[PDB]
Design a protein around this motif. Sequence first.
Motif, PDB file in Angstrom:
ATOM      1  N   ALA A  25       0.836  -1.178   0.000  1.00 45.07           N
ATOM      2  CA  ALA A  25       0.000   0.000   0.000  1.00 45.07           C
ATOM      3  C   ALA A  25       0.891   1.256   0.000  1.00 45.07           C
ATOM      4  O   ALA A  25       2.057   1.210   0.333  1.00 45.07           O
ATOM      5  N   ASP A  26       0.271   2.356  -0.405  1.00 47.05           N
ATOM      6  CA  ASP A  26       0.923   3.633  -0.571  1.00 47.05           C
ATOM      7  C   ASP A  26      -0.080   4.732  -0.334  1.00 47.05           C
ATOM      8  O   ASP A  26      -1.138   4.754  -0.970  1.00 47.05           O
ATOM      9  N   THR A  27       0.218   5.611   0.593  1.00 45.30           N
ATOM     10  CA  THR A  27      -0.716   6.685   0.956  1.00 45.30           C
ATOM     11  C   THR A  27       0.099   7.866   1.443  1.00 45.30           C
ATOM     12  O   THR A  27       1.201   7.735   1.931  1.00 45.30           O
ATOM     13  N   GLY A  30       0.921   9.211 -10.112  1.00 44.47           N
ATOM     14  CA  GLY A  30       0.527   7.953  -9.482  1.00 44.47           C
ATOM     15  C   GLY A  30       0.981   6.773 -10.300  1.00 44.47           C
ATOM     16  O   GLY A  30       1.751   6.920 -11.251  1.00 44.47           O
ATOM     17  N   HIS A  31       0.475   5.606  -9.954  1.00 41.90           N
ATOM     18  CA  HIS A  31       1.058   4.365 -10.475  1.00 41.90           C
ATOM     19  C   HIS A  31       0.249   3.188 -10.018  1.00 41.90           C
ATOM     20  O   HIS A  31      -0.380   3.220  -8.969  1.00 41.90           O
ATOM     21  N   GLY A  32       0.351   2.084 -10.761  1.00 40.44           N
ATOM     22  CA  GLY A  32      -0.142   0.833 -10.226  1.00 40.44           C
ATOM     23  C   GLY A  32       0.627   0.426  -8.981  1.00 40.44           C
ATOM     24  O   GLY A  32       1.766   0.795  -8.802  1.00 40.44           O
ATOM     25  N   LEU A  49      -4.454   0.889  -7.892  1.00 39.15           N
ATOM     26  CA  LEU A  49      -3.590   1.970  -8.260  1.00 39.15           C
ATOM     27  C   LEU A  49      -3.494   2.964  -7.106  1.00 39.15           C
ATOM     28  O   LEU A  49      -4.380   3.097  -6.266  1.00 39.15           O
ATOM     29  N   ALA A  50      -2.360   3.634  -7.056  1.00 35.47           N
ATOM     30  CA  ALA A  50      -2.121   4.763  -6.180  1.00 35.47           C
ATOM     31  C   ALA A  50      -2.418   6.011  -6.983  1.00 35.47           C
ATOM     32  O   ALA A  50      -1.828   6.268  -8.045  1.00 35.47           O
ATOM     33  N   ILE A  51      -3.388   6.769  -6.502  1.00 32.32           N
ATOM     34  CA  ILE A  51      -3.822   8.041  -7.071  1.00 32.32           C
ATOM     35  C   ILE A  51      -3.332   9.139  -6.115  1.00 32.32           C
ATOM     36  O   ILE A  51      -3.651   9.088  -4.920  1.00 32.32           O
ATOM     37  N   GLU A  52      -2.514  10.055  -6.619  1.00 32.41           N
ATOM     38  CA  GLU A  52      -1.788  10.991  -5.785  1.00 32.41           C
ATOM     39  C   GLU A  52      -1.667  12.358  -6.463  1.00 32.41           C
ATOM     40  O   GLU A  52      -0.580  12.793  -6.836  1.00 32.41           O
ATOM     41  N   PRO A  53      -2.759  13.108  -6.559  1.00 32.96           N
ATOM     42  CA  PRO A  53      -2.670  14.474  -7.085  1.00 32.96           C
ATOM     43  C   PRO A  53      -1.679  15.287  -6.240  1.00 32.96           C
ATOM     44  O   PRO A  53      -1.680  15.266  -5.028  1.00 32.96           O
ATOM     45  N   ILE A  91      -2.421  14.433  -1.817  1.00 28.32           N
ATOM     46  CA  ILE A  91      -3.244  13.444  -1.154  1.00 28.32           C
ATOM     47  C   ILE A  91      -3.091  12.161  -1.949  1.00 28.32           C
ATOM     48  O   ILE A  91      -3.302  12.185  -3.168  1.00 28.32           O
ATOM     49  N   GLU A  92      -2.757  11.066  -1.265  1.00 27.17           N
ATOM     50  CA  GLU A  92      -2.578   9.791  -1.966  1.00 27.17           C
ATOM     51  C   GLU A  92      -3.310   8.680  -1.237  1.00 27.17           C
ATOM     52  O   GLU A  92      -3.262   8.589  -0.013  1.00 27.17           O
ATOM     53  N   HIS A  93      -3.994   7.846  -2.012  1.00 20.89           N
ATOM     54  CA  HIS A  93      -4.570   6.614  -1.517  1.00 20.89           C
ATOM     55  C   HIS A  93      -4.302   5.503  -2.517  1.00 20.89           C
ATOM     56  O   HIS A  93      -4.148   5.751  -3.705  1.00 20.89           O
TER      57      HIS A  93
HETATM   58 CO   LIG Z   1       2.700   6.547  -4.773  1.00 20.12          CO
END
Ligand SMILES: [Co+2]
Length: 249
Positions: free
Chosen positions: A103-105, A167-169, A199-203, A232-234
């Motif tokens: 995980a990545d946040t 972001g990224h898978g 995916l990690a979505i990180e605007p 912000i990333e989730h």
């Molecule tokens: Co990331």
Amino acid sequence: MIVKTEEELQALKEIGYICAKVRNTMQAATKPGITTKELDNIAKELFEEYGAISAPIHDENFPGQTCISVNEEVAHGIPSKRVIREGDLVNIDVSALKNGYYADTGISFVVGESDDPMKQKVCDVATMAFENAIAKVKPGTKLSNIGKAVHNTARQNDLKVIKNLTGHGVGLSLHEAPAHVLNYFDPKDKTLLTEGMVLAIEPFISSNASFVTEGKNEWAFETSDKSFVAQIEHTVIVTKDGPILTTKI
Ligand SMILES: [Co+2]
Ligand SMILES: CSCC[C@H](N)C(O)(O)c1ccccn1
Ligand SMILES: [Co+2]
Ligand SMILES: [Co+2]
């Protein structure tokens, strides 16, 4: 990755919870007078308690459990003797693995009060941009809808995006397909989201600069103009019934 089994789903939910818990604990502890290393030590203890390992240490040999980026630093800041001060704009980015799954946040926030409301504004807009991006997430939808939403949100608020951070898978590695989840719209991209995609979505929303550069060391990314930038990333799983955020708790 693509989630295909309940065991994979559970493994992703477990590591996402752990990263969220760490992120929340670190954020709560961020106050004037704490050093970024002391904050990183919270992650060390919690990762051990929960049986997880730092992705920056494991995947990248990064000298820190987490990445903690302050003011001029946007991303990849190295926890150190730097002391947090009133009004700092801090990003804490927590990524880890447990039982092979990742995980990545991340979150940007203002410590106390700054004299410049722009610091909070970029945080507020990063949050909105994330929300607007995931409102677009469903099987069959264009990956590029995410960046289109992020940049539109920025423009609606007289702000910019960081174009060269993405972001990224995520799933079996910190970074996997789709390679890049842009913060802006690429009209030529036909890549779609699919059922079970993680995916990690990180605007990254910026007060001025549209890109970052190499900073004070070989890791940190900064802006030379000292823009205020918020992330912000989730970690998100694309499902038929809506996005599942593994790192929201
Ligand atoms: Co990331
Ligand atoms: C193991 S290094 C940590 C990478 C980080 N968690 C990130 O993928 O979210 C990220 C942050 C900033 C810019 C790009 N990617
Ligand atoms: Co991250
Ligand atoms: Co990354």
